[PDB]
């Protein structure tokens, strides 16, 4: 619906959508097209913004320019960040191990006042990484994402803390700039500036040049304030400048002239101290001043401070209604740091802009030196300019920094959520350990902005959110949510956007409104969201705003969970968390029961290939698709065939459209890794039965029918990348060549003469992937243990060849080995409702609870799980599934059945395998399914299988008897989860040990052991199993004689030698003797000894 | 020293019984 070429999904939508879900992956593209001077954003800003919208590069260059050596004799001013076309295609950039970037130019002039006038010119700095239409960067040939960072905005935060000593509340204010010193106001320490502990609040006022009568007039209301103005040794101005001079810095001779200039440099000067347009705007709107004032404002010099102290004074006075002279009237209350009106969102554009700023500041010093050392006039700024400190500042942002993450390519949705992410941790925010329990909890302002379901399950619970489907980021960097305006209980078709502080000042009504075509309210009063985001109930007189659509608040992953409202937030959270780890399958099929969001999410995610222009398909190949457009020119889209995605899974694409076929603009042509006819298809539709089955499903385990493993329905493709190189070490020079001296011939078979494996050769754990030689000894690349399968493709990056290569290394070789993972025992499965599980048992097709028509059910999920876990969703999802697969011509009635009184759009008939849409609030109702199961569907034979209640009488394949009561069978969408035995399973009898510690390693890659912790020792000692523990902590780990002696003794079949001398004790004895402590172990009686 | 690491445990002489020896 409203999408050209998609498989029509019949909808359980009770309410007609007034707005169409906006282009997903917006926050990346809008921000990045803001950062650089882009025409689309330019025109968007012309449509909604000021007459002259300044681009991020332009405004950082404006914030830098001009550079002077104080004097103002020599000047340098950059402008006009003009770009060319991109360096190469994305696929080529991923291929050649280079950065997908754009060459960057600036119109720079070197003004020289005393000498002759120098002209302007175009300066080239270097390549700047640009964002693809998939809203990602390709750094060093890997597809990296910049996640959006939640940070406390620059602005003025008022707070009230209850005193421990006295029974009197304390009002604390805290302003915080974009780049500068912290100013903070406190009631009685009075004011702190640049760690100047304890100063009277009036001093900084007096320093601004405020005479007594102006203190009495401005700060007349409230007590203490006047007593704080009174309480000071230096009442006079010059005295106060000397006082604050002495307080600011104890060292350096303090002069009155110097004090004023340093004060006015530290809190008035725009370059040294910087409060951004967000900060200026926030303090302006919160104080109420500069109402109808443009951008490009400066620091809070004086006029703000008066407003803040007045606001504080009124906050003490206890009267909300306030008006400041030369400012708009704002209400007086405490400011909440959790409220999203106060929490801004710094996005890719700004997060890059900061590093461009820091890099340009790093450049400004080098320029300031360069122009100082170089000759006057005869210098040339194009001639003398350092490129390093910016390219370094950018390269170092995408090199190792936490906010520049590897894109989650477990599927499209994983990517879409990864790019639509709100991170509270990292540089500029709060550290994971430092962050308290208050910051993590959801806040009523989160609604329709940050997902109050989706979050990681690890130590980052509530910290890393996901931005909500409909929410969009402002040029400022605030999270605006769309809503509908209502005039006197009559809703409008207009869509407005709210920043949160206005929504706080207004009343918002909920999306389940009694909606007729007119939209005039019939329900006398509706449930509404109050000023403090509290759930209230009011008549249409109070209601000014209403929720545009249901599922405002959900992320894309959260949105793609049908009957979410019947699930609990905890299991839903887990449902999303695991859904964005759901692996693509060799034959993906779209859910028979879903929401409409699956259709939309895939085509926006950008991993599917979309038809850029309206045309007719010219010819279809597996390699590429060529479309002949209306105009005459053709588009040839090249499909990435079996590309290793970042998280190890495959990114296989296929064409869906036929040769003789017309295709509209914005239509699905190719098939992504998790699309089948353009729809977010992660897992499969399987016939589930819900019951206990002979203890194989006990404690939320899952039972498979071998049919799945045989038919290859849940079979994935997993590609492990293996990288090795020939770097010229000081000894000689490394080589990638077939021939090694001390090897067998039979193992040197898969390799060709050059020393790489031939393409498609199946590898057993121990096989050679790259023949490499060290200066000759052998250091060849062998396939790691647990990994097997078919070699997709070999890449080579020769020193002689043009390819961009790391520093020192000559010839890089990467290997793609693909294992076709068949859903075996011990692999993780999960639904969409958080109902996880390990595959307890794969039954042979026949011994499987089967339908009266002879179809064996695929999975059996344990019943006891459901009421405990509190996620009945999966059962409604299951039920509807049966209605989805089993087509239903409802003999409606001569006067319509009650359940179908509020029946959705023409959803009375449905053919076999009818894929149904049910949104996460305006979806399929409780009793509807009771009507939907009561539906004739003679599956080949002239009989119904499932009853009115939705249960079926199953025959036990194993026993052969029928089950004594009818069990809840139905079709369920289940997801192949990434928590795989190829990741998790690990064994070690013996193996290769570490050099530093003398205990076995950790990890499957190095063939490590398994960690025997303290808590295991506690339990061993609780048993009192001295020998077991003392065997575990000596020969099994440490003792070098011990391990070889016990191996030798085991293989010989002799008594195990008594473990004598642990390495740990030697280490600690030697280490204690290194710190000059003489430690000697005495016996019960006699002389002491060394251990050996 | 806890559990099976006291001198009454770690030092236990287990001989096969005189009646069991000759019987073998």
């Amino acid at each position: 619906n409203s999408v050209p070429g998609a498989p029509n999904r019949v909808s359980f939508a009770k309410l007609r959508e007034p707005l169409e879900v906006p282009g997903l992956l917006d926050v990346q593209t809008d921000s990045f097209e803001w950062l650089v001077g882009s025409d689309r954003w330019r025109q968007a800003a012309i449509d909604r913004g000021e007459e002259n919208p300044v681009g991020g590069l332009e405004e950082v260059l404006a914030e830098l320019s001009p550079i002077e050596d104080f004097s103002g004799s020599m000047s340098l001013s950059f402008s006009d960040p003009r770009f060319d076309e991109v360096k190469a295609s994305v696929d080529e950039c991923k291929d050649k191990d280079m950065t997908y970037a754009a060459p960057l130019f600036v119109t720079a002039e070197f003004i020289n006042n005393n000498t002759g006038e120098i002209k302007s010119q175009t300066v080239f700095m270097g390549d700047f990484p640009m964002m693809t239409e998939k809203g990602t960067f390709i750094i060093n040939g890997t597809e990296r994402v910049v996640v959006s960072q939640l940070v406390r905005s620059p602005g003025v935060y008022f707070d009230e803390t209850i005193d421990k000593s006295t029974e009197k509340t304390l009002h604390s204010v805290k302003v915080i700039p974009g780049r500068g010193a912290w100013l903070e106001f406190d009631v009685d320490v009075g004011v702190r500036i640049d760690r100047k502990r304890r100063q009277p609040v009036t001093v900084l006022l007096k320093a601004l040049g405020w005479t007594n009568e102006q203190i009495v007039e401005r700060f007349g209301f409230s007590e203490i304030m006047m007593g704080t103005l009174e309480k000071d040794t230096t009442s006079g101005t010059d005295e106060a400048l000397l006082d604050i001079y002495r307080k600011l810095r104890p060292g350096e001779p303090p002069t009155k002239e110097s004090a004023q200039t340093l004060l006015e440099n530290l809190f008035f000067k725009e370059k040294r101290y910087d409060l951004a347009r967000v900060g200026r705007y926030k303090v302006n709107k919160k104080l109420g001043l500069n109402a109808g004032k443009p951008i490009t404002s400066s620091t809070l010099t004086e006029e703000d401070v008066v407003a803040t102290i007045e606001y504080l004074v009124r906050l003490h006075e206890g009267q909300t209604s306030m008006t400041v002279p030369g400012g708009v009237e704002v209400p007086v209350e405490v400011d909440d740091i959790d409220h999203f009106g106060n929490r801004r969102l710094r996005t890719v554009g700004e997060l890059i802009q900061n590093q461009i700023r820091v890099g340009l500041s790093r450049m400004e010093r080098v320029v300031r030196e360069r122009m100082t050392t170089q000759d006057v006039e005869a210098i040339t700024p194009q001639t003398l300019i350092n490129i390093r400190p910016v390219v370094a500042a950018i390269k170092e942002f995408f090199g190792t920094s936490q906010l520049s993450q590897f894109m989650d390519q477990n599927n499209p949705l994983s990517g879409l959520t990864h790019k639509r992410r709100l991170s509270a941790l990292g540089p500029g925010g709060l550290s994971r350990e430092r962050a308290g329990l208050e910051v993590r909890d959801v806040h009523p302002s989160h609604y329709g902005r940050m997902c109050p379901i989706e979050t990681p399950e690890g130590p980052n619970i509530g910290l890393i959110g996901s931005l909500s489907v409909y929410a969009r980021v402002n040029p400022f960097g605030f999270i605006e949510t769309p809503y509908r305006k209502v005039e006197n209980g009559v809703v409008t078709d207009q869509i407005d956007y709210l920043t949160a502080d206005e929504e706080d000042r207004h009343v918002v009504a909920q999306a389940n409104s009694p909606t007729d075509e007119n939209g005039r309210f019939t329900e006398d009063r509706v449930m509404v969201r109050k000023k403090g985001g509290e759930v209230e109930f009011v008549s249409a007189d109070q209601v000014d705003y209403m929720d545009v659509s249901p599922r405002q608040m959900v992320s894309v992953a959260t949105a793609m969970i049908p009957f979410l409202e019947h699930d609990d937030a905890n299991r839903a959270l887990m449902g999303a968390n695991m859904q964005r780890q759901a692996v693509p399958l060799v034959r993906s099929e779209a859910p028979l029961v879903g929401t409409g969001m699956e259709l939309r999410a895939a085509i926006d995610a950008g991993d599917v290939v979309v038809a850029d222009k309206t045309g007719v398909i010219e010819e279809v190949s597996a390699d590429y698709i060529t479309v002949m457009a209306d105009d005459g020119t053709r588009q040839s889209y090249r499909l990435r065939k079996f590309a290793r995605s970042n998280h190890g899974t495959c990114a296989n694409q296929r064409p869906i459209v036929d040769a003789g076929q017309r295709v509209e603009a914005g239509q699905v042509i190719a098939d992504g890794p998790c699309t089948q006819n353009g729809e977010m298809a992660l897992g499969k539709n399987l016939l589930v039965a819900i019951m206990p089955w002979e203890g194989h499903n006990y404690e939320d385990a899952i039972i498979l029918s071998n049919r799945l493993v045989e038919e290859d329905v849940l079979t994935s493709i997993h590609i492990e990348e293996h990288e090795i190189d020939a770097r010229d070490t000081k000894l000689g020079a490394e080589e990638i060549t077939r021939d090694i001296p001390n090897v067998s011939d039979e193992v040197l078979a898969d390799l060709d003469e050059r020393g790489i494996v031939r393409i498609g050769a199946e590898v057993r754990d121990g096989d050679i992937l790259v023949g490499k030689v060290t200066p000759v000894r052998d250091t060849s690349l062998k396939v790691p243990h647990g990994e097997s399968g078919k070699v997709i493709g070999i890449r080579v990056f020769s020193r002689e060849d043009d390819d961009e290569l790391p520093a020192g290394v000559n010839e890089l070789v990467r290997v793609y080995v693909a294992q076709k993972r068949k859903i075996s025992d011990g692999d993780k499965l999960a639904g969409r409702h958080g109902n996880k599980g390990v595959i307890g048992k794969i039954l042979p097709v026949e011994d499987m609870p089967f339908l009266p028509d002879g179809t064996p059910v695929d999975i059996i999920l344990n019943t006891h799980g459901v009421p405990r876990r509190m996620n009945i969703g999966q059962i409604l999802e299951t039920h509807l599934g049966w209605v989805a697969k089993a087509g239903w011509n409802i003999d409606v009635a001569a006067g319509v059945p009650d359940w179908a009184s509020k029946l959705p759009e023409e959803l009375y008939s449905a053919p076999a395998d009818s894929t149904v849409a049910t949104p996460v609030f305006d979806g399929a109702q409780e009793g509807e399914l009771a009507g939907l199961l009561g539906s004739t569907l003679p599956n080949r034979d002239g009989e119904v299988m499932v009853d009115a209640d939705g249960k079926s009488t199953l025959f036990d394949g194993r026993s052969g008897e029928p089950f004594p009561y009818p069990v809840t069978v139905g079709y369920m969408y289940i997801l192949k989860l990434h928590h795989l035995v190829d990741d998790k399973i690990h064994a070690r009898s013996t193996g290769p040990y570490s050099m530093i510690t003398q205990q076995p390693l950790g990890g499957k890659a190095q063939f490590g052991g398994q960690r025997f912790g303290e808590m295991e020792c506690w339990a061993m000692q609780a048993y009192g199993a001295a020998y077991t523990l003392q065997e575990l902590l000596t020969i099994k780990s440490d003792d070098t004689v011990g391990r070889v002696k016990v191996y030798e003794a085991i293989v010989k079949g002799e008594n195990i030698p008594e473990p004598g001398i642990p390495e740990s004790f030697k280490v600690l004895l030697k280490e204690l003797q290194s710190l000059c402590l003489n430690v000697e172990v005495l016996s019960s009686d006699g002389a002491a000894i060394e251990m050996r | 020293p806890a559990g099976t690491g006291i001198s009454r445990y770690r030092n236990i002489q287990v001989q096969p019984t005189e009646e069991a020896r000759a019987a073998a």
């Binding site: 006990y698 025992d825 996880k836 928590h979 064994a987 780990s1037 | -």
Partner: protein
């Protein structure tokens, strides 16, 4: 081609350099102020070597980060004791994903046959060379590597009543570790017993358990005698049975025994 060294080397080098200079200052006959300054700097260097960041500013090498002194290798959360001396990774040990194996007796568990084959790799070789299955120990070590049909009939003979210690981190109580008899099962999953999940606190929702192989006769014995599930039914806490019907078996036996009127026969 890069060299990985220890910070100690820098500090010892400083100390020995300062010492060897001071020696030459004594040899030449330098003024007492120079010599005493050298002695002060030496004192500072040795002081820093024994404990860095103990007095004033610490010594920093690359990028203004303080070097780990000798006392730094015996202090802090990550020096010694808290991590290094208390917990470490071991041999003759594995870790897999757990699944319910409801066929099994309480003393029995199930092992993934490959994982098992790797976990008893010597014990199988021993029997494979003690029998005429492998001609020589090297050839046995090849045959176990190739995983040939002749080892599987032996692995039952080697695993016959040979206990293994199942442990789940975090180990919250004594019954958090339990010994079992490993049955050999196909697949990639550890088949846990449904009764020991109350003890282990282990839901089958992607949780993983470590297996350990006791080697010494003492360890093997103690595994069989103390920590065998069949022995540890009652809680150390109270003495209420923890290895008891739970979740499913409860509803099963409850339905089985519940006497309801108005029924057939």
């Amino acid at each position: 081609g890069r060299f990985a060294t220890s910070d100690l080397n820098d500090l010892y080098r400083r100390v020995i350099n300062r010492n060897n200079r001071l020696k030459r200052l004594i040899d030449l006959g330098a003024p007492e102020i120079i010599v005493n300054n050298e002695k002060r700097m030496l004192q500072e260097s040795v002081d820093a070597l024994f404990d860095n960041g103990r007095r004033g500013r610490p010594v920093t090498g690359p990028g203004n980060r303080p070097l780990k002194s000798l006392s730094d290798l015996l202090k802090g959360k990550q020096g010694r004791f808290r991590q290094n001396l208390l917990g470490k990774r071991v041999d003759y040990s594995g870790r897999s994903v757990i699944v319910v194996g409801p066929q099994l007796k309480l003393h029995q568990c199930g092992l993934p046959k490959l994982m098992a084959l790797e976990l008893f790799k010597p014990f199988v070789m021993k029997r494979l060379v003690d029998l005429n299955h492998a001609q020589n120990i090297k050839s046995a070590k090849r045959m176990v590597e190739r995983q040939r049909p002749q080892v599987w009939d032996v692995l039952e003979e080697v695993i016959a009543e040979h206990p293994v210690l199942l442990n789940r981190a975090p180990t919250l109580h004594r019954l958090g570790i339990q010994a079992f008899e490993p049955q050999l099962v196909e697949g990639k999953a550890i088949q846990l017993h449904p009764l020991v999940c109350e003890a282990f606190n282990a839901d089958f929702d992607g949780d993983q358990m470590a297996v350990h192989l006791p080697l010494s006769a003492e360890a093997q014995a103690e595994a069989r005698i103390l920590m065998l599930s069949s022995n540890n039914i009652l809680s150390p806490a109270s003495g209420k049975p923890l290895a008891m019907p739970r979740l499913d078996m409860v509803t099963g036996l409850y339905y089985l025994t519940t006497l309801v009127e108005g029924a057939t026969g």
